[PDB]
Amino acid sequence: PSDIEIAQAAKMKPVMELARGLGIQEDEVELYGKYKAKISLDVYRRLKDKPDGKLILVTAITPTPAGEGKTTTSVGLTDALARLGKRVMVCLREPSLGPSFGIKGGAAGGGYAQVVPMEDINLHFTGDIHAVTYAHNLLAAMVDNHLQQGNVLNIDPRTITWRRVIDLNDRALRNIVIGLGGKANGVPRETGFDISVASEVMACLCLASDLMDLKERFSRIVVGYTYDGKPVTAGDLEAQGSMALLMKDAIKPNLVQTLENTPAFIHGGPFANIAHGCNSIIATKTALKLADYVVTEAGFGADLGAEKFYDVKCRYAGFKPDATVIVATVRALKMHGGVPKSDLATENLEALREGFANLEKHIENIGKFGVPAVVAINAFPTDTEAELNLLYELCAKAGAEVALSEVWAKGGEGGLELARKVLQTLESRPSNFHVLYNLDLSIKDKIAKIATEIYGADGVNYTAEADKAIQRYESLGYGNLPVVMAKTQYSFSDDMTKLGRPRNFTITVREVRLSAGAGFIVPITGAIMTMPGLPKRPAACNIDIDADGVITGL
Amino acid sequence: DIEIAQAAKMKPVMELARGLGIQEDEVELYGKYKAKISLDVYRRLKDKPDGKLILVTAITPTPAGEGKTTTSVGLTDALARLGKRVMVCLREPSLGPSFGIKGGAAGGGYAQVVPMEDINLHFTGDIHAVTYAHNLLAAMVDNHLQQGNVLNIDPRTITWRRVIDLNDRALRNIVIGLGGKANGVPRETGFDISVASEVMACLCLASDLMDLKERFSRIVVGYTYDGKPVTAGDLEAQGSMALLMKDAIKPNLVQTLENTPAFIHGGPFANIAHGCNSIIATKTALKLADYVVTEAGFGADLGAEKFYDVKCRYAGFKPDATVIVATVRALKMHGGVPKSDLATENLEALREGFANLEKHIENIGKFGVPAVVAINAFPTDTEAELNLLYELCAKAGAEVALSEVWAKGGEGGLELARKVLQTLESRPSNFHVLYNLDLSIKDKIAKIATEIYGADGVNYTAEADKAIQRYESLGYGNLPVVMAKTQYSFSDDMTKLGRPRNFTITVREVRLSAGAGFIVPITGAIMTMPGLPKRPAACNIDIDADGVITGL
Ligand SMILES: Nc1ncnc2c1ncn2[C@@H]1O[C@H](COP(=O)(O)OP(=O)(O)O)[C@@H](O)[C@H]1O
Ligand SMILES: Nc1ncnc2c1ncn2[C@@H]1O[C@H](COP(=O)(O)OP(=O)(O)O)[C@@H](O)[C@H]1O
Ligand SMILES: [Mg+2]
Ligand SMILES: [Mg+2]
């Protein structure tokens, strides 16, 4: 039964009620209708010295374009725990608007494991991405006005790294020339747009602890350089105050719920292939005051999202994840064993056997961070009973804790086996969380650490552009920043072609960006683009709404 | 006395809503002090009586503005202070100008709508809905070119621009689709400011979500190589566009500082677009109130004519009175006093500049709705100067009232409120439009230019000629006209002050808004994306652990 059919038929508690059931007081809630709200940052502030609940991360194997089921699983696990009577919350990322009209669709879950109101969540929600987009683009506009008004600071406009942003898959704005028409109309220069969720401004939102912090980070954002190579910042242009203003509400996290009325925060939405892939620190640390157990997702596979959750988010938050759930699927493991994407509804026992190496490696990789894993087998409607025991069997045989999850088709009661297993590991195998690398290393050493330890490459190559940039950033004193790698989600390699556990290969960084405001560095690898495109048949064509109800949203 | 420093005073909008006879389950809250009202309110009240409709317009402005909004709000509070059941309908301010020059559009002093900062920034996200529907269409157009261009669109004739609600001059003329075969198809475009979007115009003229969707579908984005038009319908975008507008379509309820209810819905500018708030908000408010005050942008040559010939025409409104805001400082400017000298007294310059207001007074008379001048008093106004004007007005002889609504709130608008009631009770209106749709495009341009602006005639650049021919050829000859033209003069020349004579308008570009249902001749040098000044107000804007430091 279609995801929007059942999302629209849902039966929701007023969120003011859920809020109150969490120790949040009426005047700390700001409603966006009965079913959505924003929680004050005073909640976390007044509880600063109270103990945390347990932190549970969900990550996954290397996906197909439709995705496996982190979100779908995160929601379900949360519903299952609520059904064992636990005081639990999910933290998730706000879905990017753009992909609802292209390809992979929304990010509110699936079947009976969803967050709702789904169509709000997937579209405009509470206006957060819009606030990111306007602060980002206001800065750009100010940069461009500056050039026009005599270029007082002597910016070399051919070095401006600050791009524009919009929350759509618009490939035609990747590379553009701007400022044309003559002397009344700006200064010609080459730029383009990224998708808003990849904005550094969203990164700042996701790492900041409150408005004034966000304002200070904004002011350290570097937009470009003078003709003599001195950096020029958003604070040099006095933009941070306006930028902060535009984020005045977006800083607060959003409360919705699951289909079974369990509470859920949704806040910040960076992708994990081209950004840091986590929800806001603010959401997650607030939730940890409010619930005994907090489930949260990192984007794409564990080589990307899980790695950056540990090495960036946890680092900057002081978080100590207690357990980690790895989502695996028969569909995907078969793909990693040879089966084409068009033949996956077919049984193939060997292609799951030789596809397993993929998961083998993700488990290995999680183990390196010292937090105990449980595998979740997200049973797809087509997966045969035989394929399903083999995977169970392979996970046990590898030593790993496992559980089948029928959360998609059955909701929270599809996730009891799994929920017990997570509870089992919280109670019986404590976590020993530590980062992969220290901050005092070179940029190139940190990159090589991730390259070799996680993706399993032999080493890393640099274009001259990249080398020039790394020099620049260490010499300017940003050498201590952590690394958010941009790379394809479809492989451990930077070649989207290398399925499974590719061996004897090299990653090539072509471009290096600096996020001095969010406080990390972004080495861009392979051919990954920072603005995605629409397909031949965009979801949009099938999308509609009548005197009430909507179709084509997924 | 700072605008933003009146961040004090309000009551829950839900109380305000029930007090207009709106049901609880028709109110959607965005905090305790903003809401969206269902379209079911108007529907169920369809057969009930309309209140009195009052338009507030103005003389030709100083860049700072002459106080329409400030006056519309004041008037509303003043009527309430006379025990009247009254509402204001306003436009949502464009976000861009709060960081630019002119600021937000929530009023002034003690005549403002609140919560101001929300109202002027993201508000309830309508402008963002507009922006994304428009730009998703743009994105689908470009994707289509990229995926074999099956419809054979000549990318060099695409009229559909992109949009963003900032003053960004550098996005006026751009080249996109660069980088090779994987990254699109190169083409010249740019951006307009979001409030000037056709999508906004449609929102502002439509009656519900399914009307809006069908309008979207009729939007022409460009042409095939053999000149066949291609629509948003042909690309199947209207459903998604409408989805993104599902809440934007419902109007918003806020209030005034003295707690009078207010609708804010739709933002289009009057120089570049059609300059009125939504029909939805206006027609709804007529059911809930005995008196509905509403503003049209810039001077009467722009917003008034458009409110009358476009909004009123499509809505079936008959306006009952019209208020013309005038100021001493502006009249002086028009009498030759430089911008920098408008604080200093100068009676003779005020006598000379009167001509401007005189023509606006005449022009309102041609639509057949009676008029009341509001003289909106600034702190620099001499007692002598305010008397000269009042005398000038009654000798004209229009009804006049001094207004101290800015400094005093509704108490300051009693004499004005009285005169307006006095006009509605004795001098009923005989509204009629300036022109008929049967005319040709060029004839309608020429009525408006001749009768309202005072031009001797109109010239067309070759490009404008082509376009007008193309639209007549295609069946759109019968559309009404929404002139784009500078607010600073009756002419298309921003330096021709007072009441210029013996001038000609030149239209250099003509757009077709097939979905909103009008045509836009662009005159003189006016741009559809504005720019940021030397020192933008953004540079002085800030927020601490609570308090905001600029709204202007
Ligand atoms: N077990 C399942 N069977 C069928 N569809 C599923 C299942 N789990 C998830 N989905 C659907 O597949 C897509 C991917 O799920 P999602 O939770 O979004 O994965 P991820 O979070 O890793 O991107 C969504 O459309 C979801 O509704
Ligand atoms: N009587 C007055 N004294 C001082 N400032 C005023 C007065 N009336 C309006 N203003 C201010 O001047 C600017 C323009 O007023 P506004 O109501 O926006 O006119 P318009 O709607 O025609 O632009 C605003 O900053 C407003 O607060
Ligand atoms: Mg997901
Ligand atoms: Mg105004």
Tab-separated table of N, CA and C in Angstrom, chain A residues 374-438:
chain	number	residue	atom	x	y	z
A	374	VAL	N	25.139	-4.437	15.410
A	374	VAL	CA	24.126	-5.442	15.162
A	374	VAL	C	23.784	-5.240	13.721
A	375	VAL	N	23.602	-6.315	12.977
A	375	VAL	CA	23.151	-6.186	11.604
A	375	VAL	C	21.637	-6.251	11.614
A	376	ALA	N	21.015	-5.371	10.831
A	376	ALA	CA	19.596	-5.438	10.535
A	376	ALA	C	19.385	-5.950	9.120
A	377	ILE	N	18.717	-7.098	8.986
A	377	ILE	CA	18.297	-7.548	7.659
A	377	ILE	C	16.913	-7.011	7.336
A	378	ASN	N	16.897	-6.031	6.441
A	378	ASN	CA	15.682	-5.397	6.007
A	378	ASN	C	15.109	-6.244	4.889
A	379	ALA	N	14.169	-7.106	5.258
A	379	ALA	CA	13.541	-8.039	4.328
A	379	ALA	C	12.656	-7.345	3.302
A	380	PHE	N	13.025	-7.461	2.030
A	380	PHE	CA	12.266	-6.822	0.968
A	380	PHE	C	11.232	-7.807	0.486
A	381	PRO	N	10.090	-7.300	-0.012
A	381	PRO	CA	8.970	-8.145	-0.442
A	381	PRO	C	9.347	-9.283	-1.368
A	382	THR	N	10.438	-9.124	-2.110
A	382	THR	CA	10.884	-10.130	-3.070
A	382	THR	C	11.901	-11.121	-2.483
A	383	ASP	N	12.554	-10.764	-1.383
A	383	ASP	CA	13.614	-11.606	-0.840
A	383	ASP	C	13.021	-12.976	-0.505
A	384	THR	N	13.665	-14.054	-0.954
A	384	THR	CA	13.176	-15.411	-0.664
A	384	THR	C	13.581	-15.798	0.744
A	385	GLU	N	12.776	-16.658	1.360
A	385	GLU	CA	13.085	-17.191	2.679
A	385	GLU	C	14.507	-17.801	2.751
A	386	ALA	N	14.969	-18.408	1.660
A	386	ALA	CA	16.285	-19.053	1.649
A	386	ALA	C	17.407	-18.027	1.638
A	387	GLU	N	17.257	-17.019	0.798
A	387	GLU	CA	18.221	-15.931	0.765
A	387	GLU	C	18.308	-15.294	2.152
A	388	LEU	N	17.159	-15.199	2.833
A	388	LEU	CA	17.079	-14.566	4.157
A	388	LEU	C	17.765	-15.338	5.288
A	389	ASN	N	17.790	-16.666	5.237
A	389	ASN	CA	18.494	-17.414	6.290
A	389	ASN	C	19.981	-17.428	6.052
A	390	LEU	N	20.364	-17.534	4.782
A	390	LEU	CA	21.763	-17.509	4.386
A	390	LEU	C	22.458	-16.250	4.913
A	391	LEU	N	21.814	-15.102	4.717
A	391	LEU	CA	22.375	-13.846	5.205
A	391	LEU	C	22.490	-13.891	6.739
A	392	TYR	N	21.395	-14.281	7.401
A	392	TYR	CA	21.415	-14.472	8.850
A	392	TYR	C	22.635	-15.315	9.153
A	393	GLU	N	22.670	-16.498	8.540
A	393	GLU	CA	23.721	-17.490	8.750
A	393	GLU	C	25.135	-16.925	8.535
A	394	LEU	N	25.350	-16.236	7.417
A	394	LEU	CA	26.646	-15.575	7.133
A	394	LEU	C	27.063	-14.551	8.209
A	395	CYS	N	26.097	-13.820	8.762
A	395	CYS	CA	26.391	-12.807	9.779
A	395	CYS	C	26.804	-13.402	11.113
A	396	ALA	N	26.130	-14.489	11.486
A	396	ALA	CA	26.495	-15.302	12.656
A	396	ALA	C	27.869	-15.928	12.463
A	397	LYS	N	28.025	-16.623	11.336
A	397	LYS	CA	29.294	-17.253	10.945
A	397	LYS	C	30.451	-16.242	11.007
A	398	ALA	N	30.187	-14.979	10.674
A	398	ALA	CA	31.225	-13.950	10.798
A	398	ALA	C	31.386	-13.487	12.244
A	399	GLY	N	30.534	-14.001	13.136
A	399	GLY	CA	30.530	-13.620	14.546
A	399	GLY	C	29.484	-12.570	14.909
A	400	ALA	N	29.019	-11.804	13.919
A	400	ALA	CA	28.225	-10.586	14.164
A	400	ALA	C	26.788	-10.839	14.655
A	401	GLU	N	26.328	-10.035	15.617
A	401	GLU	CA	24.911	-10.026	16.029
A	401	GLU	C	24.015	-9.620	14.854
A	402	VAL	N	22.884	-10.296	14.717
A	402	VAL	CA	22.020	-10.122	13.564
A	402	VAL	C	20.574	-10.117	14.010
A	403	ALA	N	19.717	-9.553	13.176
A	403	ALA	CA	18.293	-9.758	13.321
A	403	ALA	C	17.544	-9.356	12.067
A	404	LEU	N	16.540	-10.157	11.741
A	404	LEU	CA	15.633	-9.864	10.656
A	404	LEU	C	14.703	-8.734	11.086
A	405	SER	N	14.413	-7.819	10.167
A	405	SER	CA	13.559	-6.675	10.450
A	405	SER	C	12.455	-6.549	9.410
A	406	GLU	N	11.224	-6.802	9.850
A	406	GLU	CA	10.045	-6.712	8.998
A	406	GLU	C	9.234	-5.458	9.347
A	407	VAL	N	9.973	-4.473	9.829
A	407	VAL	CA	9.496	-3.136	10.121
A	407	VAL	C	8.777	-2.406	8.941
A	408	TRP	N	9.205	-2.655	7.696
A	408	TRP	CA	8.555	-2.049	6.522
A	408	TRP	C	7.118	-2.490	6.398
A	409	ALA	N	6.914	-3.803	6.456
A	409	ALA	CA	5.601	-4.372	6.200
A	409	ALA	C	4.720	-4.404	7.448
A	410	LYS	N	5.332	-4.483	8.628
A	410	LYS	CA	4.590	-4.720	9.872
A	410	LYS	C	4.708	-3.602	10.909
A	411	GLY	N	5.579	-2.631	10.670
A	411	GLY	CA	5.765	-1.540	11.612
A	411	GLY	C	6.595	-1.995	12.779
A	412	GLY	N	6.444	-1.312	13.910
A	412	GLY	CA	7.248	-1.569	15.110
A	412	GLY	C	7.299	-3.013	15.588
A	413	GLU	N	6.203	-3.744	15.402
A	413	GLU	CA	6.191	-5.148	15.790
A	413	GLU	C	6.946	-6.027	14.799
A	414	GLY	N	7.322	-5.460	13.655
A	414	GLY	CA	8.279	-6.112	12.758
A	414	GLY	C	9.707	-5.975	13.253
A	415	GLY	N	9.925	-5.216	14.333
A	415	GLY	CA	11.266	-4.872	14.819
A	415	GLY	C	11.606	-5.266	16.255
A	416	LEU	N	10.774	-6.109	16.852
A	416	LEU	CA	11.048	-6.601	18.196
A	416	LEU	C	12.330	-7.432	18.308
A	417	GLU	N	12.507	-8.449	17.452
A	417	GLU	CA	13.750	-9.254	17.466
A	417	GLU	C	14.961	-8.318	17.466
A	418	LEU	N	14.944	-7.363	16.532
A	418	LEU	CA	16.023	-6.400	16.386
A	418	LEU	C	16.177	-5.516	17.608
A	419	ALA	N	15.062	-4.969	18.101
A	419	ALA	CA	15.096	-4.124	19.281
A	419	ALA	C	15.677	-4.825	20.514
A	420	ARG	N	15.251	-6.069	20.791
A	420	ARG	CA	15.873	-6.883	21.862
A	420	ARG	C	17.389	-6.976	21.651
A	421	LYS	N	17.806	-7.355	20.448
A	421	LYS	CA	19.229	-7.452	20.164
A	421	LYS	C	20.001	-6.173	20.473
A	422	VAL	N	19.453	-5.013	20.143
A	422	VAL	CA	20.134	-3.754	20.436
A	422	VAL	C	20.220	-3.551	21.952
A	423	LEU	N	19.089	-3.769	22.615
A	423	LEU	CA	18.991	-3.720	24.072
A	423	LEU	C	19.960	-4.681	24.706
A	424	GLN	N	20.006	-5.891	24.156
A	424	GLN	CA	20.943	-6.928	24.596
A	424	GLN	C	22.362	-6.342	24.588
A	425	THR	N	22.767	-5.743	23.469
A	425	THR	CA	24.138	-5.235	23.371
A	425	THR	C	24.369	-3.983	24.242
A	426	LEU	N	23.356	-3.146	24.463
A	426	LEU	CA	23.559	-2.000	25.358
A	426	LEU	C	23.859	-2.475	26.769
A	427	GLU	N	23.140	-3.519	27.182
A	427	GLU	CA	23.213	-4.057	28.541
A	427	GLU	C	24.473	-4.931	28.723
A	428	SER	N	24.907	-5.612	27.653
A	428	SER	CA	25.977	-6.619	27.764
A	428	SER	C	27.324	-6.325	27.043
A	429	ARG	N	27.379	-5.489	26.008
A	429	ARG	CA	28.699	-5.127	25.421
A	429	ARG	C	28.859	-3.624	25.354
A	430	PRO	N	29.498	-3.016	26.370
A	430	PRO	CA	29.619	-1.561	26.392
A	430	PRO	C	30.541	-1.063	25.278
A	431	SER	N	30.393	0.205	24.905
A	431	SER	CA	31.122	0.744	23.772
A	431	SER	C	32.409	1.400	24.244
A	432	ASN	N	33.358	1.441	23.320
A	432	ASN	CA	34.683	1.939	23.553
A	432	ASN	C	34.988	2.959	22.457
A	433	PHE	N	34.136	3.976	22.333
A	433	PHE	CA	34.188	4.849	21.155
A	433	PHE	C	35.447	5.694	21.098
A	434	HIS	N	36.127	5.690	19.962
A	434	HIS	CA	37.218	6.640	19.737
A	434	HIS	C	37.343	6.965	18.257
A	435	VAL	N	37.805	8.183	17.988
A	435	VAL	CA	38.005	8.688	16.618
A	435	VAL	C	39.118	7.943	15.861
A	436	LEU	N	39.048	7.976	14.542
A	436	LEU	CA	40.020	7.261	13.724
A	436	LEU	C	41.399	7.949	13.707
A	437	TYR	N	41.411	9.269	13.859
A	437	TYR	CA	42.606	10.072	13.605
A	437	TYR	C	42.606	11.270	14.520
A	438	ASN	N	43.776	11.807	14.852
A	438	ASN	CA	43.834	13.048	15.620
A	438	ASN	C	43.953	14.285	14.758
